[PDB]
Amino acid sequence: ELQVIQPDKSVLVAAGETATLRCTATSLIPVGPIQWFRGAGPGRELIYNQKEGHFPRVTTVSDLTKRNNMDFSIRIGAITPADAGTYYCVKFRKGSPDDVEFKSGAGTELSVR
Amino acid sequence: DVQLLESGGGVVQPGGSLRLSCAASGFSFSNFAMTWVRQAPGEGLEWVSTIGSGDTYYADSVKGRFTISRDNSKNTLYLQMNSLRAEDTAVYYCAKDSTVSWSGDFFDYWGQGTLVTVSSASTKGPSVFPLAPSSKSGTAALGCLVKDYFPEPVTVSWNSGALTSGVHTFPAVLQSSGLYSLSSVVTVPSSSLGTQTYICNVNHKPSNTKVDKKVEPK
Amino acid sequence: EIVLTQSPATLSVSPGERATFSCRASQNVKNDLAWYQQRPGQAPRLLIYAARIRETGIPERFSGSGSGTEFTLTITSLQSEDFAVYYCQQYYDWPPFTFGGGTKVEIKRTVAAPSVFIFPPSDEQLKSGTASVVCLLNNFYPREAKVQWKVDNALQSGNSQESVTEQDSKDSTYSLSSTLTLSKADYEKHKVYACEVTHQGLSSPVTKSFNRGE
């Protein structure tokens, strides 16, 4: 079946540098988008979404024309002390009444020092 | 290389059932979503259903009637169709899904397709009627009228395959009776009417019918 | 739910020139667009995905461009193989996948006036109890033509079907057949059966008539 894996538990980065938060899924099926969030609670912040919204400081590590891509690592540019926290890589299942959450990675601690 | 081979398509009544199978080869069938897309005669492509790994999706016109199933032990994709409607007549293609970056699921490899015919019509051999020639403008046009046959695969040849030039075999048209009609014509020099004899060879495999009509003026 | 509209539905281009057609979508802002090529007796094959990415093994002539709602597929030098129907497919928003109406790339040639022929129903078909009147349009370009059946100067509506030949590979012309079906009693009550044909290659419409006396 499929698992969403975040290998790095902690990572950090000086101000103005690029932090890499890596994520890899085992399989593409069930079909669904991969989203990155900061925090686990109800008021969590969407960090990256491929289809909609603009996330300027986020770049996809797997890069374009990566066919059948299963590497869902992200890169957050120009890091500030404000962007410190725990980031979760979550897999979603395609669903109407709005999509549904399926599996979430352990999480990667980001700091700033 | 990737190969998709369909099977299980034929002619059945409205409301009957039929099961399609698409055996995948040349790629890891277990790690990809598979799709069915149908194409009615003389019209464009229409998506039917999509399966991933227990997650299934269906078109609006199809939601309650069809169920997609896959077996990774056989590397086969199935689509069992129940309560078949007459409009569901189309060429059914099995296809493999592929994703770019983080956006997902276009169709890279398509199967050759299996033909399904939903009709109340009876299996019947065609009646072949001649179209007597008459010149218009030193060239004459002759032909054979193939009328009331089912299913749709009909073969026409002239002089047992000897004649090729000026031959026009039109696509089959479905009539109000539920049967197909077709005409095949040949343009020939007017002086060639007395010199040659013209025979049209109609073959209908489902009815096991072979007839040769000679076309000559009265 | 996202419907795709393709304009130049039919596109007539000369061999060796350039052909460009567009696909338009509603409610998709991104690049989740795919282009496909389908030949008459063959399954579709993917040319371009994600708007501008050309599939491996596809010639450099095929190129896709555009984002948001407007997209375009371009072929630098039209070849014999390229003449087929082309579909656009979006995968941006799908519980339901959606396809474009399709654009058929067609060979352009000089105008050719149709040759009209008249065929009365055969004697044996009359014995069967049905009368078929067939009128033939052969070797004409372009495809657009107007066929009108008149029986004793009375136009027939709803009792005729028409079939058209795919473009001939040798002369790039079309051929059309319109079959008029009447009952034997209906055929015998009337005298003259006419096939009126209107085409741009003709100065005025050509009428092919026969009297039921032979």
Q: Choose the closest CB to B112 out of C43, C96, C124.
A: C43
Give, in order, the Cα–Cα distances in Å from B58 to each of B29, B80, B169, C56: 20, 13, 38, 30
Same domain? For C151 and C101 the reply is: no
- Start-to-end CA distance of chain C, whole Å, equals 59
Token digits of residue C18: 């350039």
B52 and A31: CB-CB below 8 Å? yes
Last-in-domain residue among C77, C92, C109:
C109
Last-in-domain residue among B86, B120, B154: B120
**What is the Cα gyration radius of chain B?**
22
Answer yes or no: do C53 and A65 touch at CB < 8 A.
yes
Residues of C whose CB is below 8 A from A52: 29-30
Is B129 within 8 Å of C132 (Cβ atoms)?
yes
Written as six digits, the tokens of B10 are: 């034929």
DSSP label of C206: E
Q: Tokens representing C75?
A: 């072929």
Cα distance between the two ends of chain B: 59
Nearest chain A residue to B102 by CA: give it: A50
Q: Is there a single domain that holds both residue C6 and residue C101?
A: yes
Flag whether residue B50 sits within 8 Å of chain A, measured between CB atoms: yes
Residue A45 is classified by DSSP as E
A73 touches chain B (CB under 8 A): no
Considering the domain architecture, whether residues C131 and C85 belong to the same structural domain is answered as no
Residue B33: CB atoms within 10 A of its CB come to: 24
Do B102 and B135 have their domain in common? no
Question: Do residue B104 and residue B139 come from a single domain?
Answer: no
Name the closest residue on chain A to residue C31, using Cα atoms.
Answer: A51
- Distance, in Å, from the CA atom of B152 to the CA atom of B10, rounded to the nearest integer, reads 11
Which helix (H) or strand (E) is A11 found in, with range? Answer: strand A10-11
- In sequence order, the β-bridge partners of residue A47 are none
For residues C119 and C133, what is the distance between their CA atoms, to the nearest angstrom? Answer: 6
Give the nearest chain A residue to B99 (CA atoms): A68
Determine the Cα–Cα distance for residues C186 and C37; give it in Å rounded to an integer: 47
Containing structural domain, residue B196: 121-218
Two structure tokens written together for A61: 């590590």
What is the rounded distance in angstroms from the CA atom of residue C172 to the CA atom of residue B51? 42
- Measured in degrees and rounded to the nearest 5, phi and psi for residue C56 equal -65, 145
Residues B103 and C32: beta-carbon distance below 8 Å: yes
Q: How far, in Å, are A55, A76, A110, C16 from residue A80 at the CA level?
A: 15, 10, 11, 56
How many other CB atoms are found less than 10 A from the CB of residue B85? Answer: 13
> Are B143 and B89 members of one domain?
no
How many CB atoms are closer than 10 A to CB C141? 23
d(CA C60, CA C47): 11
- Split into its structural domains, chain C has a count of 2
C40 and C75 together in one domain: yes
Q: Residue C53 and residue A96: Cβ atoms within 8 Å?
A: no
Residue bearing tokens 């609670």: A41
Number of Cβ within a 10 Å radius of residue C33: 28
Q: Are B158 and B213 within 8 A, CB to CB?
A: no
Are the beta carbons of C174 and C107 closer than 8 angstroms? Answer: no
User: What does DSSP say about strands C70-75 and C19-25: parallel, antiparallel, or unpaired?
Assistant: antiparallel
Task: Indicate the residue of C30, C50, C95 with minimum beta-carbon distance to A51.
Answer: C30
Closest CA to C80 of C186, C187, C172: C172
Domain that holds residue C175: 110-214
Which three-class secondary structure state does DSSP give residue A83?
helix
User: Cα-atom radius of gyration of chain C, to the nearest Å?
Assistant: 23
Specify the 3-state DSSP secondary structure of C57: coil
State whether B140 and B59 are in the same domain: no
Structure tokens at B167: 């031959």
Place of tokens 């057949």: C177
DSSP string, chain B: --EEEEE---EE-TT--EEEEEEEESS-GGGS-EEEEEE-TTS-EEEEEEESSS-EEE-TTTTTTEEEEEETTTTEEEEEE-S--GGG-EEEEEEEEEEETTEEEEEEEE---EEEEE--PPPBPPEEEEEEEEE---EEEEEEEEEEEBSS-EEEEETTTTB-TTEEEPPPEE-TTS-EEEEEEEEEETTHHHH--EEEEEEETTTTEEEEEEE---
Contact residues, chain C, for B57 at CB < 8 Å: 94-96
Resolution of this model in Å is: 2.4
Q: How far apart are CA B186 and CA B181, in angstroms?
A: 17
Shortest Cα–Cα distance, B127 to chain C (Å): 9
Q: C168: burial class by Cβ within 10 Å (0-12, 13-18, 19+)?
A: middle
Q: Are residues C100 and C130 in the same domain?
A: no
- The DSSP letter of residue C28 is -
- How many domains does chain B divide into? 2
Task: Supply the DSSP string of C1-26, one letter for each residue.
Answer: ---EEEESSEEEE-TTS-EEEEEEES
Using CA coordinates, name the residue in chain B closest to C47: B108
Please state, in angstroms and rounded to a whole number, the distance separating the CA atoms of residues B49 and C97: 9
B71 touches chain C (CB under 8 A): no
* Co-location of B111 and B183 in the same domain: no
Does C53 touch chain A if contact means CB atoms closer than 8 Å?
yes
List the determination method: X-ray
Q: Are residues B110 and B128 in the same domain?
A: no
Residue B211's CB is within 10 A of a number of other CB atoms, namely 15
DSSP letter for each residue of C173-205:
-EEEEEEEEEEHHHHHH--EEEEEEE-TTSSS-
Instruction: Tell me the CATH number at C45.
Output: 2.60.40.10
- Please tell me which of the candidates B145, B187, B218 has its beta carbon nearest to residue C134: B145
Show which of B120, B152, B168 is a domain's final residue: B120
B15 and B57 inside one domain = yes
Do C85 and C135 lie in one domain? The reply is: no
| Selected residues 147-206 of chain C with any CB under 8 Å from a CB in chain B | 161-166, 175, 177, 179, 181
Looking at B120, B140, B166, which one is the last position of a domain? Answer: B120
- Which amino acid is present at A91? K
Write out chain B residues lying below 8 Å of A63, CB-based. 101
- C92 and C24 inside one domain: yes
Angle at C194 between CA B185 and CA C196, to 5 degrees: 80
Regarding whether B104 and B127 lie in a shared domain, the answer is no
Question: Which domains, ranges and CATH numbers included, belong to chain A?
Answer: 3-113 (2.60.40.10)
Question: What CATH number is given to the structural domain containing B163?
Answer: 2.60.40.10
Residues C65 and C139 in one domain: no
Helix, strand or coil for residue A106?
A: coil
Q: Which of C91, C109, C127 is the last residue of a domain?
A: C109
Test B129 with C122 for CB contact under 8 angstroms.
Answer: yes
What contacts A43, CB < 8 A, 6 or more positions away? Answer: none
- Whether residue C22 is found in the same domain as residue C90: yes
